[PDB]
Design a protein around this ligand. Structure first.
Ligand SMILES: *[C@@H]1O[C@H](CO)[C@@H](O[C@@H]2O[C@H](CO)[C@@H](O[C@@H]3O[C@H](CO[C@H]4O[C@H](CO)[C@@H](O)[C@H](O[C@H]5O[C@H](CO)[C@@H](O)[C@H](O)[C@@H]5O[C@H]5O[C@H](CO)[C@@H](O)[C@H](O)[C@@H]5O)[C@@H]4O)[C@@H](O)[C@H](O[C@H]4O[C@H](CO)[C@@H](O)[C@H](O)[C@@H]4O[C@@H]4O[C@H](CO)[C@@H](O)[C@H](O)[C@H]4NC(C)=O)[C@@H]3O)[C@H](O)[C@H]2NC(C)=O)[C@H](O)[C@H]1NC(C)=O
Ligand SMILES: *[C@@H]1O[C@H](CO)[C@@H](O[C@@H]2O[C@H](CO)[C@@H](O)[C@H](O)[C@H]2NC(C)=O)[C@H](O)[C@H]1NC(C)=O
Ligand SMILES: *[C@@H]1O[C@H](CO)[C@@H](O[C@@H]2O[C@H](CO)[C@@H](O)[C@H](O)[C@H]2NC(C)=O)[C@H](O)[C@H]1NC(C)=O
Ligand SMILES: *[C@@H]1O[C@H](CO)[C@@H](O[C@@H]2O[C@H](CO)[C@@H](O)[C@H](O)[C@H]2NC(C)=O)[C@H](O)[C@H]1NC(C)=O
Ligand SMILES: *[C@@H]1O[C@H](CO)[C@@H](O[C@@H]2O[C@H](CO)[C@@H](O)[C@H](O)[C@H]2NC(C)=O)[C@H](O)[C@H]1NC(C)=O
Ligand SMILES: *[C@@H]1O[C@H](CO)[C@@H](O[C@@H]2O[C@H](CO)[C@@H](O)[C@H](O)[C@H]2NC(C)=O)[C@H](O)[C@H]1NC(C)=O
Ligand SMILES: *[C@@H]1O[C@H](CO)[C@@H](O[C@@H]2O[C@H](CO)[C@@H](O)[C@H](O)[C@H]2NC(C)=O)[C@H](O)[C@H]1NC(C)=O
Ligand SMILES: *[C@@H]1O[C@H](CO)[C@@H](O)[C@H](O)[C@H]1NC(C)=O
Lengths: 445, 48, 124, 94, 49, 49, 44
């Protein structure tokens, strides 16, 4: 800070659009277990011994059923806003000078993924669960997916198909454009995308004159920022790493489930066929009982873990709904919640197990140190004093009686002080006392 | 079999668990009254 | 290696066999098809879905108690029994089957319908 | 005991990613980002307004008029200093 | 124990993954030091504060 | 047989320890996100909430 | 030139369907009213 009257403020002179990427999980993979098949692998002698443990298998099955039901309710709640969201159709390709091609579904059978969604899904290795006819495909022998029918667990399909997910993300893209100055949420204005962007920029401190002088430059910078998302999905980025981690947690659950069937639990073998071949009663039944008890305890652990993961995913889905409402369907005033820098607009796309956000922010690149005033007063017998609205009172320098100007807080461009950019306030000893070159709001005549 | 006992102790009704898929669902829940839903039941038996 | 005669995996389970007839056989443990039951309490009726199974295999396996009027129907989630294809469309339902399908219970056979949501207001 | 039991039982406590000097750097970054402007819309500019002036701007914005603030400057500072000084003696079971 | 060789490795790998995830989370929190403008304070009294 | 009892018991116990540590790590990451939100809302600005 | 913009509402024509007669309405309920300094502000 400066020792003189007033203060120094760094005001941007150039800028770029920055993109922050963020992944939010909304589901896990749903698993059901046939307890009797998992424990006894279809051998009558084992099943006869298991009947003394009949209550515990049913409890395992019912717990898994409850968890899957709760996830179905949570995912239904998130998608339901499609039925209550007003939308405005966009144009294919350019909207004004803004190029939205990467985020739109291209226009045989209709497609269900935008170009950027295609690029993201192509970089992730996900096994095909085969909902339609995977059993016969696995019959055509030639791993974790085909292990469903051996071990006795089943991957259940998700509640909605990809065409419903595309409907949701198209509903989001059609709810961005709209008004900015209105109080409630009851009206719907069909303002084109480019005009909406320019209203959002004006509200974070870039004055109308600057915007009119830099229309094409702003559109080109925006297009450059959008075009670089294509080439970013990599090991360095945290959000993409989170996507891969969600996929890997799903795979690890199944692999741990299948591996436990090779545990001997201290018996002579992990295979019931071997035990029946090598021993005789009563030693035979004790050996099988070891496997029964071990496998039941292991299933109890698996069920507890799945309950925990399902609860966490439901919480994360609530967070995704909040992010959609705050960053995608409106412009955010919260520091740090919707990307970095000053938030302008956000887009949401589908990703494995959740939603992937692109937060577009206004990011300055160079600054000037400007000399500013807390306020301005005249010397009338009762003084009259003014303060800036959404900006600063500054001198027109990049380095007595002085000529004071106004600038918007997000871009240095001195302009005359008028009643449009100033307001009357109570007197303060920090304010500059002006004798000559009074701005019109301070003129006694 | 699934057996229902009245207060006096007699068996008044029963379900043959292996008759069809609904009977298996009822035996799994140990109940004659099941809620509306979609349930996973015991797989088709594979024997040599 | 054919002269070693047995092929194993990383868990020391047998996965292949070289026969003296000259052919090689893949080996898998005995498998069981999934079964799911759709139950409506109000009408006290039910239907079945064999997930991930084409209708032909289930048609054969039944020949191998009641499961063993409409024929089996192929859906995107497996082969369905006790269901009539309805070009029907709904925006809510009680009995989802996955992949935007759900079952319509009989008002006192089941019907298969799809889930499609519509925007309330579109303004040009 | 629990620390020396690492080498008997066969588990190891791994050190944290950053040392205490980086943590002090972080909390000094926080203390240097408090003072600033109040009336501006965006987040792109940085005004070097001293701490006391920033506090008085924050008070004016919650409904204390300029005349009151000018009449009670030293009283407000003394009350603030009293509130800061009592954190020292508070860490307790309650 | 060699007949239980797979299970020990899985335990070690799970712990390694968890520690890696915490390191990423703590790095994310501290990263704002590189993007936060600051103003130097005075030692002791700032005004009368 | 006696040694096998210890082997099986200790492996099951380690599985439980690993599950608990996973849970605690996830909770701490959520709490760190809450700390970042508190810094941004209460320390780096004045809150109207 | 001198220019105005609405405060918490819209400048609209009094129709449910050249020189035109502009009115003001609140954004949550359609009820055209005369444009005054109560519901408008000066802008660039
Ligand atoms: C109301 O709501 C309902 C429900 O949402 C709407 O109904 C759906 O409408 C769509 C669009 O008409 C239907 O989509 C078609 O389905 C065909 C059948 O698909 C099944 O069988 C396939 C094998 O034959 C199988 O692959 C497929 O499953 C895979 O794909 C689905 C997603 O489609 C996944 O969920 C599955 O998990 C599975 O995925 C795996 O395979 C994928 C493909 O390799 C991988 O991407 C994935 O990662 C997995 O590995 C399913 O069981 C299907 O054949 C049709 O495919 C054509 O169209 C799509 C989309 O454009 C292309 O991507 C395909 O390549 C293919 O393209 C071309 O189609 C034309 C026309 O058919 C053909 O002439 C041309 O030769 C094809 N050429 C090429 C390039 O391949 C398509 O997906 C869907 O089935 C309906 N669902 C129902 C009826 O329940 C309904 O429309 C709504 N109504 C209104 C008014 O909106
Ligand atoms: C704002 O920053 C951009 C990027 O640095 C500047 O654009 C470059 O300007 C130089 C000349 O100074 C040209 O040679 C480059 O080709 C420009 N790069 C582009 C257009 O991508 C731009 O001039 C800056 N604006 C200012 C300083 O007002
Ligand atoms: C908007 O941007 C897209 C890319 O994000 C442009 O499309 C690409 O254009 C090149 C050159 O013609 C083609 O090789 C690519 O295949 C296109 N990608 C597509 C279609 O996804 C598009 O041309 C741009 N639009 C304008 C008018 O600038
Ligand atoms: C503020 O100062 C700048 C110079 O630092 C003025 O810019 C010049 O304005 C004249 C008249 O429009 C132009 O012919 C010059 O080319 C401008 N120079 C530059 C470097 O842009 C600017 O007009 C001043 N603004 C005021 C007085 O409101
Ligand atoms: C503007 O002029 C007024 C006097 O008209 C100055 O007010 C005095 O400010 C000092 C502190 O700087 C106080 O001790 C006096 O009590 C004030 N006098 C009155 C009558 O209020 C004011 O400081 C000047 N502002 C400047 C130069 O920035
Ligand atoms: C229900 O019946 C309709 C026909 O009445 C089936 O729809 C046809 O499916 C084929 C194969 O996908 C398409 O080539 C046709 O274009 C579809 N026709 C219409 C009108 O959409 C539909 O698939 C059936 N649903 C089932 C079997 O579940
Ligand atoms: C806006 O237009 C409506 C008609 O569409 C005007 O409503 C009529 O106003 C007259 C005078 O008050 C009444 O006698 C009629 O009964 C009204 N008709 C209806 C359908 O309400 C309304 O006054 C106009 N508002 C203006 C001019 O500010
Ligand atoms: C308003 O316009 C839309 C088309 O943009 C039309 O569907 C709707 O019916 C119109 N509403 C009225 C009140 O005429």
């Amino acid at each position: 800070p400066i020792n003189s009257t007033g203060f120094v403020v760094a005001v941007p002179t150039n800028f770029t659009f920055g993109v922050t990427q963020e992944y939010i999980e909304t589901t896990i993979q749903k698993i059901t277990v046939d307890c009797k098949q998992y424990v006894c692998n279809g051998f009558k002698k084992c099943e006869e011994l298991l009947t003394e443990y009949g209550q515990f298998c049913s409890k395992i099955n019912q717990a898994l059923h409850g968890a899957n039901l709760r996830q179905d309710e949570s995912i239904a709640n998130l998608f339901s806003s499609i039925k209550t969201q007003n939308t405005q159709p966009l144009q294919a390709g350019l909207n004004g000078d803004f190029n939205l091609t990467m985020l739109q579904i291209p226009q045989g059978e209709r497609k269900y993924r935008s170009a950027i969604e295609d690029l993201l899904f192509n970089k992730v290795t996900i096994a095909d669960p085969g909902y339609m006819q995977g059993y016969d495909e696995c019959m055509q022998q030639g791993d974790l997916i085909c292990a469903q029918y051996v071990a006795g667990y089943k991957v259940l399909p998700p509640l909605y198909d990809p065409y419903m997910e595309a409907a949701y993300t198209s509903s989001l893209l059609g709810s961005i454009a709209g008004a900015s100055w209105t109080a409630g949420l009851s009206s719907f204005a069909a303002i084109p995308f480019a005009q909406s962007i320019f209203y959002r920029l004006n509200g974070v401190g870039i004055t109308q004159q600057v915007l009119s002088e830099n229309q094409k430059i702003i559109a080109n910078k925006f297009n450059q920022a959008l075009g670089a998302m294509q080439t970013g999905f990599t090991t360095t980025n945290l959000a993409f790493n989170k996507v891969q981690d969600a996929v890997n947690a799903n795979a690890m659950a199944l692999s741990k489930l299948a591996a436990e069937l090779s545990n001997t639990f201290g018996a002579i073998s992990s295979s019931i066929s071997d035990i029946l071949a090598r021993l005789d009663p009563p030693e035979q039944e004790a050996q099988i009982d070891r496997l029964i008890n071990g496998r039941l305890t292991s299933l109890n652990a698996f069920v507890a873990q799945q309950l925990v993961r399902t609860e966490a995913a439901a919480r994360s889905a609530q967070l995704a709904q909040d992010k959609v409402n705050e960053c995608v369907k409106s412009q955010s005033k919260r520091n740090g919640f919707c990307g970095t820098g000053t938030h302008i607009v956000s887009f949401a796309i589908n990703a494995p197990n959740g939603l992937y956000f692109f937060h577009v922010g206004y990011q300055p690149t160079s600054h000037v140190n400007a000399t500013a005033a807390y306020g301005l007063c005249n010397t009338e017998n009762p003084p009259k004093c003014i303060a800036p609205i959404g900006g600063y009172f500054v001198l027109n320098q990049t380095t007595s009686e002085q000529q004071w100007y106004y600038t918007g807080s997000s871009f240095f461009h001195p302009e005359p002080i008028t009643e449009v950019n100033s307001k009357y306030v109570s007197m303060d000893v920090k304010f500059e006392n002006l004798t000559n070159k009074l701005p019109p709001p301070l003129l006694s005549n | 079999y699934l057996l229902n006992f009245d207060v006096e102790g007699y068996i008044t009704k029963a379900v043959d668990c292996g008759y069809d898929d609904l009977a298996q669902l009822q035996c799994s829940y140990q109940s004659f009254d099941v809620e509306t839903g979609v349930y996973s039941v015991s797989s088709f038996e594979a024997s040599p | 290696l054919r002269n070693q005669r047995f092929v194993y995996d990383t868990f020391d389970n047998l996965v292949g066999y070289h026969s003296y007839n000259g052919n090689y056989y893949c080996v898998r443990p005995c498998v069981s098809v999934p079964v799911s039951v759709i139950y409506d309490k109000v009408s006290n009726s039910h239907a079945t879905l064999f997930g991930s199974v084409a209708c032909s295999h289930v048609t054969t396996m039944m020949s191998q108690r009641m499961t063993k009027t409409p024929g089996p129907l192929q859906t995107v989630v497996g082969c369905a029994m006790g269901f009539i294809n309805t070009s029907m469309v709904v925006d809510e339902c009680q009995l989802p089957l996955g992949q935007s399908l759900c079952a319509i219970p009989p008002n006192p056979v089941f019907q298969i319908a799809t889930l499609n949501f519509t925007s309330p207001l579109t303004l040009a």
